[PDB]
Structure formats: structure tokens, C-alpha cells
Amino acid sequence: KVFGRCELAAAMKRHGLDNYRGYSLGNWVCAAKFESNFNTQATNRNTDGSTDYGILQINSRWWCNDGRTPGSRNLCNIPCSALLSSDITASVNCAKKIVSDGNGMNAWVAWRNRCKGTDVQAWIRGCRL
Ligand SMILES: [Cl-]
Ligand code: NA
């Protein structure tokens, strides 16, 4: 599923992301835009053999199992395919775990390089929230 900007905002708000660990809604929408272009089906393979999955590009090295990343962990306890679903519940739940692990949203490279320090509120502006 390819979300609209406001549609995803509303979805993330419903799932408890707005102000989660101090990060306003705009930060999550911004990260999703640059990580996956709002496409729940986005996959990208990394040099190390791991793959990033879904709307927030969560990595199979630590967070989910895809049966092809040797010596990896599954800290979200889910198959990585579950992060590609049109329902973002699994991705949200797992992202909450990642952002709590000490490094905040810095775990998302696109957030650090393209959202952090920017007017992220602009990503939810005009939405009925
Ligand atoms: Cl933080
Ligand atoms: Na894994």
C-alpha cells in the first residue's frame, strides 16, 4: 500500500506514535517519506546481507527474521514479511522498540540526514488530525 501523507499521519497517531519517546508526529512521517516513500512494500538489500523492510525500513540484522541473514537477531519477534503489510501495526510496534533502545530516531539514517533539525511539523501541516 502506498499511503497518502495525511493518511499515514492519522494512522501513526492512532497507533500511539505522536510524541512517542518525545518525537512529534512530524518526525515519523518525515522518516517514512524518506525511508520508503510511504510504500509499505519497500525492500532494500544492504552490503552486509541484511535487508530493510517496510514503511520504516526496519533491518533484518536485529529486528525481524527473513531466514536469510545469518547470525542475526529477531528482537521484534516477527517475520520481516509482516512489516510489508498494508496494516502498519507490526511496523509501529517494532519501531517503538527500536526508538526506545538508546539512540532514539538516529537509528533511521534518512531521519538523521533529512529530517533531524528541520521543520518536521511541515509533514503534518494541513492534515485533519
Ligand atoms: Cl531520544
Ligand atoms: Na534477523
XYZ file of N, CA and C and ligand atoms in Angstrom:
389
model
N 0.863 -1.235 0.000
C 0.000 0.000 0.000
C 0.877 1.254 0.000
N 0.535 2.234 -0.830
C 1.269 3.482 -0.803
C 0.414 4.509 -0.025
N 0.844 4.928 1.162
C 0.000 5.857 1.916
C 0.026 7.278 1.363
N -1.100 8.006 1.497
C -1.037 9.497 1.481
C -0.307 10.041 2.734
N 0.281 11.239 2.610
C 0.983 11.897 3.721
C 0.016 12.011 4.934
N -1.183 12.627 4.749
C -2.100 12.776 5.890
C -2.703 11.464 6.368
N -2.980 10.575 5.437
C -3.487 9.251 5.784
C -2.520 8.511 6.722
N -1.222 8.591 6.396
C -0.257 7.903 7.268
C -0.132 8.590 8.618
N -0.128 9.898 8.628
C -0.107 10.668 9.849
C -1.175 10.214 10.829
N -2.389 10.065 10.307
C -3.573 9.677 11.045
C -3.426 8.257 11.535
N -2.935 7.393 10.677
C -2.637 6.052 11.085
C -1.589 5.989 12.215
N -0.509 6.782 12.092
C 0.568 6.705 13.102
C 0.078 7.268 14.434
N -0.706 8.335 14.352
C -1.282 8.969 15.552
C -2.138 7.948 16.316
N -2.993 7.224 15.570
C -3.831 6.200 16.154
C -3.016 5.129 16.854
N -1.860 4.787 16.279
C -1.058 3.724 16.864
C -0.132 4.209 18.003
N -0.285 5.448 18.487
C 0.500 5.894 19.668
C 1.885 6.485 19.373
N 2.218 6.727 18.086
C 3.497 7.392 17.696
C 3.686 8.859 17.967
N 2.611 9.653 18.071
C 2.773 11.106 18.244
C 3.285 11.415 19.655
N 4.438 12.104 19.737
C 5.206 12.296 20.957
C 5.800 11.030 21.600
N 5.815 9.882 20.912
C 6.408 8.655 21.493
C 7.885 8.857 21.714
N 8.313 8.679 22.961
C 9.694 8.994 23.413
C 10.093 10.376 23.071
N 9.121 11.279 23.029
C 9.443 12.691 22.781
C 9.474 13.124 21.322
N 9.189 12.215 20.378
C 9.302 12.566 18.939
C 7.928 12.892 18.384
N 7.724 14.128 17.969
C 6.433 14.540 17.462
C 6.094 13.807 16.171
N 4.811 13.770 15.861
C 4.299 13.065 14.705
C 5.042 13.393 13.436
N 5.351 14.665 13.243
C 6.046 15.057 12.049
C 7.376 14.307 11.799
N 8.099 13.974 12.860
C 9.380 13.229 12.722
C 9.149 11.823 12.092
N 8.089 11.130 12.505
C 7.778 9.765 11.990
C 7.328 9.811 10.551
N 6.503 10.784 10.182
C 6.032 10.960 8.820
C 7.200 11.302 7.885
N 8.059 12.203 8.305
C 9.267 12.552 7.602
C 10.161 11.326 7.385
N 10.413 10.558 8.440
C 11.248 9.393 8.296
C 10.640 8.405 7.271
N 9.335 8.128 7.390
C 8.655 7.218 6.464
C 8.739 7.709 5.016
N 8.557 9.018 4.805
C 8.672 9.572 3.437
C 10.029 9.283 2.783
N 11.110 9.567 3.524
C 12.425 9.349 3.005
C 12.967 7.955 3.068
N 12.458 7.131 3.965
C 12.881 5.746 4.034
C 12.247 4.894 2.930
N 10.966 5.085 2.701
C 10.197 4.191 1.837
C 9.287 4.876 0.856
N 9.254 6.209 0.882
C 8.294 6.985 0.028
C 6.865 6.564 0.348
N 6.661 6.254 1.613
C 5.312 5.869 2.111
C 4.781 4.550 1.551
N 5.654 3.694 1.045
C 5.272 2.398 0.462
C 5.500 1.258 1.458
N 4.454 0.587 1.917
C 4.649 -0.491 2.857
C 5.428 -1.677 2.224
N 5.489 -1.759 0.912
C 6.147 -2.860 0.267
C 7.629 -2.632 -0.027
N 8.161 -1.486 0.365
C 9.601 -1.172 0.077
C 10.553 -2.211 0.773
N 11.503 -2.692 -0.025
C 12.605 -3.516 0.471
C 13.860 -2.959 -0.124
N 14.926 -3.050 0.655
C 16.268 -2.682 0.170
C 17.346 -3.556 0.796
N 18.218 -4.113 -0.038
C 19.272 -5.036 0.463
C 20.488 -4.231 0.811
N 21.172 -4.568 1.916
C 22.407 -3.876 2.328
C 23.638 -4.687 2.047
N 24.778 -4.037 1.994
C 26.052 -4.711 1.756
C 26.292 -5.931 2.675
N 25.868 -5.826 3.906
C 26.172 -6.866 4.848
C 25.263 -8.071 4.650
N 24.346 -8.029 3.685
C 23.473 -9.168 3.503
C 22.106 -9.028 4.175
N 21.974 -8.011 5.029
C 20.726 -7.778 5.711
C 19.777 -7.037 4.723
N 18.473 -6.934 5.032
C 17.511 -6.253 4.163
C 16.699 -5.359 5.068
N 16.324 -4.234 4.561
C 15.408 -3.304 5.249
C 13.988 -3.477 4.707
N 12.959 -3.424 5.574
C 11.595 -3.827 5.166
C 10.545 -2.810 5.615
N 9.715 -2.441 4.660
C 8.506 -1.755 5.010
C 8.630 -0.252 5.026
N 7.549 0.333 5.507
C 7.399 1.743 5.542
C 8.474 2.476 6.356
N 9.016 1.817 7.396
C 10.097 2.418 8.162
C 11.428 1.713 7.964
N 11.503 0.833 6.962
C 12.762 0.201 6.576
C 13.500 -0.428 7.737
N 12.837 -1.309 8.435
C 13.395 -1.895 9.616
C 14.297 -3.049 9.087
N 15.465 -3.173 9.735
C 16.547 -4.011 9.296
C 16.509 -5.462 9.901
N 16.765 -6.429 9.019
C 16.672 -7.871 9.402
C 17.907 -8.269 10.249
N 18.961 -7.441 10.315
C 20.111 -7.791 11.166
C 19.750 -7.897 12.652
N 18.851 -7.034 13.125
C 18.473 -7.041 14.545
C 17.015 -7.294 14.814
N 16.129 -6.897 13.890
C 14.724 -6.642 14.307
C 13.692 -7.681 13.898
N 13.968 -8.407 12.832
C 12.946 -9.362 12.326
C 13.661 -10.500 11.635
N 12.933 -11.598 11.426
C 13.517 -12.725 10.778
C 13.150 -12.862 9.311
N 14.116 -12.995 8.420
C 13.724 -13.210 6.997
C 14.359 -14.504 6.471
N 14.994 -15.235 7.380
C 15.548 -16.578 7.097
C 16.803 -16.484 6.252
N 17.269 -15.281 5.940
C 18.439 -15.198 5.109
C 19.525 -14.264 5.649
N 19.502 -13.951 6.944
C 20.523 -13.027 7.478
C 21.240 -13.790 8.595
N 22.260 -14.547 8.248
C 22.915 -15.433 9.214
C 23.452 -14.721 10.436
N 23.154 -15.304 11.586
C 23.696 -14.742 12.830
C 22.969 -13.468 13.213
N 21.768 -13.260 12.665
C 21.010 -12.089 13.029
C 20.083 -12.372 14.238
N 19.541 -11.295 14.811
C 18.577 -11.442 15.861
C 17.185 -11.088 15.326
N 16.176 -11.431 16.070
C 14.806 -11.137 15.746
C 14.206 -10.430 17.013
N 14.633 -9.228 17.318
C 14.236 -8.552 18.564
C 12.796 -8.105 18.570
N 12.204 -7.888 17.377
C 10.785 -7.650 17.324
C 9.920 -8.869 17.326
N 10.534 -10.037 17.202
C 9.885 -11.339 17.223
C 8.829 -11.513 16.126
N 9.194 -11.252 14.893
C 8.239 -11.261 13.837
C 8.949 -11.621 12.595
N 8.233 -12.167 11.659
C 8.864 -12.351 10.343
C 8.900 -10.968 9.648
N 9.964 -10.722 8.877
C 10.171 -9.414 8.260
C 9.048 -9.142 7.273
N 8.500 -10.200 6.672
C 7.356 -10.017 5.724
C 6.163 -9.329 6.362
N 5.977 -9.536 7.646
C 4.906 -8.860 8.385
C 5.045 -7.337 8.397
N 6.235 -6.837 8.136
C 6.464 -5.396 8.031
C 6.108 -4.810 6.688
N 5.660 -5.655 5.763
C 5.295 -5.185 4.434
C 3.771 -5.044 4.260
N 3.053 -5.440 5.269
C 1.593 -5.424 5.261
C 1.005 -4.022 5.037
N -0.190 -3.966 4.441
C -0.928 -2.695 4.326
C -1.327 -2.147 5.734
N -1.395 -3.012 6.738
C -1.701 -2.620 8.108
C -0.347 -2.340 8.739
N -0.163 -1.127 9.263
C 1.191 -0.734 9.770
C 1.430 -1.126 11.182
N 0.458 -1.820 11.761
C 0.572 -2.165 13.181
C 1.941 -2.816 13.529
N 2.355 -3.834 12.788
C 3.596 -4.521 13.091
C 4.798 -3.591 12.978
N 4.810 -2.737 11.966
C 5.944 -1.813 11.804
C 6.019 -0.805 12.971
N 4.862 -0.261 13.362
C 4.767 0.657 14.501
C 5.234 0.043 15.779
N 4.739 -1.144 16.078
C 5.126 -1.801 17.302
C 6.619 -2.038 17.404
N 7.206 -2.417 16.274
C 8.627 -2.678 16.214
C 9.464 -1.385 16.282
N 9.041 -0.363 15.527
C 9.675 0.978 15.591
C 9.705 1.501 17.046
N 8.642 1.277 17.814
C 8.629 1.695 19.227
C 9.707 1.024 20.032
N 9.946 -0.232 19.719
C 11.059 -0.903 20.344
C 12.416 -0.313 19.931
N 12.584 -0.034 18.632
C 13.868 0.454 18.142
C 14.183 1.843 18.759
N 13.211 2.757 18.717
C 13.424 4.166 19.190
C 13.647 4.246 20.715
N 13.240 3.187 21.450
C 13.473 3.086 22.902
C 14.877 2.498 23.245
N 15.678 2.100 22.262
C 16.825 1.276 22.594
C 18.056 2.124 22.951
N 17.897 3.466 22.988
C 19.017 4.304 23.455
C 19.403 5.396 22.455
N 19.289 5.097 21.143
C 19.773 6.024 20.086
C 18.656 6.845 19.457
N 17.452 6.680 19.978
C 16.315 7.432 19.521
C 16.121 7.156 18.023
N 15.697 8.191 17.302
C 15.407 8.097 15.870
C 16.660 8.138 15.033
N 17.828 8.355 15.672
C 19.093 8.245 14.979
C 19.342 6.886 14.356
N 18.609 5.869 14.790
C 18.654 4.544 14.164
C 18.192 4.584 12.714
N 17.429 5.617 12.314
C 16.969 5.771 10.937
C 17.850 6.748 10.257
N 18.682 6.236 9.350
C 19.641 7.083 8.672
C 19.002 8.241 7.892
N 17.884 8.007 7.232
C 17.232 9.049 6.474
C 16.659 10.111 7.394
N 16.157 9.698 8.580
C 15.717 10.702 9.569
C 16.875 11.617 10.012
N 18.009 10.998 10.372
C 19.166 11.783 10.793
C 19.628 12.759 9.679
N 19.683 12.296 8.399
C 20.251 13.104 7.301
C 19.271 14.025 6.661
N 17.958 13.785 6.818
C 16.925 14.554 6.043
C 15.773 15.157 6.849
N 15.612 14.754 8.117
C 14.536 15.250 8.977
C 15.029 15.961 10.215
N 16.002 15.317 10.868
C 16.547 15.901 12.115
C 16.959 17.351 11.902
N 16.492 18.208 12.806
C 16.859 19.653 12.757
C 16.082 20.469 11.723
N 15.056 19.870 11.153
C 14.348 20.546 10.074
C 12.978 20.847 10.674
N 12.164 21.581 9.917
C 10.838 21.881 10.443
C 9.961 20.659 10.131
N 10.020 19.621 10.991
C 9.305 18.356 10.694
C 7.761 18.521 10.849
N 7.334 19.579 11.542
C 5.923 19.856 11.690
C 5.257 20.074 10.303
N 6.049 20.555 9.365
C 5.581 20.747 7.999
C 4.963 19.447 7.370
N 5.414 18.281 7.868
C 4.908 16.996 7.337
C 3.492 16.657 7.753
N 2.993 17.279 8.786
C 1.604 17.031 9.150
C 0.687 18.262 8.950
N 1.259 19.341 8.436
C 0.532 20.606 8.257
C -0.622 20.393 7.257
N -1.782 21.002 7.534
C -2.996 20.785 6.685
C -3.757 19.482 6.910
N -3.192 18.532 7.677
C -3.925 17.265 7.948
C -5.003 17.431 9.008
N -6.110 16.744 8.824
C -7.140 16.711 9.855
C -6.766 15.657 10.874
N -6.195 16.077 12.000
C -5.662 15.107 12.983
C -6.396 15.284 14.303
Cl 15.860 10.447 22.174
Na 17.065 -11.246 11.779
